[PDB]
Design a protein around this ligand. Structure first.
Ligand SMILES: Cc1cccc(Cl)c1NC(=O)c1cnc(Nc2cc(C(=O)NC3CCNCC3)cc(-c3ccccc3N)c2)s1
Length: 295
């Protein structure tokens, strides 16, 4: 028995603005009337346009069904679905600052170290919750994390191919594409061994995305060049202005041997201890001089 997913009546949903457009549906900002007409809240609304295939329907509704099993501050909240009327819709809370990667790239250098570390603690708490629920995300990356007005970060992007046994799409993105290599642990790339410990590798890459304000991991390297570097033992260098303890933690997430990586519980605990003793964050890792400027 799974937690009940609310079927929403279309009369309770208004769409105010298109915010995203795909080939197979759109995403809107809107309002949802709830509590039997007594409350109204802002929502995001994703549609599935007519002509969708059986696979697209099972995937679309499956994402909502997974989201509906979770109740955590750092996981996107589902309000419900419209499946009985067309276009079908999934309705979630609305995250005012959108995806974390784009948000940081529009906010370069504007946050404190403590704020960035706090964002990572929230993401880590959401991932701890997911891993404890026996959910392996497989595509953890800043692009799949949303940010609200209050800077709370929440994990998004769920799918049935992550939960069903021997699923033939388990190694693809939720859109059927190739999962971007540069967030993925070596044993998941080479053997398809996706587990919470490969999600810990990905979380280390997310830490580096956050501390760099959304830089592209490995910069211009191609996918094969990233695989070359990782398998030689190369790891991403420290971000600028990054606490030594934070860079050490991301390096531990990138241990080749998956059993040596921290668990999500370890990550949350370490981040909490650093935030509560903030002088621990003033020791910075050396930023490796990339350019020589002499005068
Ligand atoms: C509805 C739904 C169904 C299934 C799965 C999920 Cl996770 C969801 N929920 C959502 O997608 C979303 C919840 N909140 C969101 N916030 C959001 C917010 C905004 C938006 O208003 N962003 C601000 C606009 C001004 N710049 C600062 C960001 C834009 C998007 C967005 C959506 C599609 C393509 C590009 C975009 N930039 C998204 S999207």
């Amino acid at each position: 028995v799974l937690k009940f997913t609310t079927e929403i009546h279309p009369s309770c949903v208004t769409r105010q603005k298109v915010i995203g457009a795909g080939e197979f549906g759109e995403v809107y900002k809107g309002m949802l009337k709830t509590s039997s007409g007594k409350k109204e809240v802002p929502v995001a609304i994703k549609t599935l346009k007519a002509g969708y295939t059986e696979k697209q329907r099972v995937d679309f509704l499956g994402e909502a069904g997974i989201m509906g099993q979770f109740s955590h501050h750092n996981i996107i909240r589902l309000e419900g679905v419209i499946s009985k009327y067309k276009p079908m819709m999934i309705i979630t809370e609305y995250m005012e600052n959108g995806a974390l990667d784009k948000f940081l790239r529009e906010k370069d250098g504007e946050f404190s170290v403590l704020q960035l570390v706090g964002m990572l603690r929230g993401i880590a708490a959401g991932m701890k919750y997911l891993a404890n629920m026996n959910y392996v995300h497989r595509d953890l990356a800043a692009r799949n994390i949303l940010v609200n007005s209050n800077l709370v970060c929440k994990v998004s992007d769920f799918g049935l191919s992550r939960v069903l046994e021997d699923d033939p799409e388990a190694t693809y993105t939720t859109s059927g594409g190739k999962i971007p290599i540069r967030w993925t642990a070596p044993e998941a790339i080479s053997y398809r061994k996706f587990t919470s410990a490969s999600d810990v590798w990905s979380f280390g890459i997310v830490m580096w995305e956050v501390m760099t304000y959304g830089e592209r991991p490995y910069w211009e390297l191609s996918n094969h060049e990233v695989m070359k570097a990782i398998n030689d033992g190369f790891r991403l260098p420290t971000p600028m202005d990054c606490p030594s303890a934070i860079y050490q933690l991301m390096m531990q997430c990138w241990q080749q041997e998956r059993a040596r990586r921290p668990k999500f519980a370890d990550i949350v605990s370490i981040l909490d201890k650093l935030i509560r003793a903030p002088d621990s964050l003033k020791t910075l890792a050396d930023f490796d001089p990339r350019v020589s400027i002499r005068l």
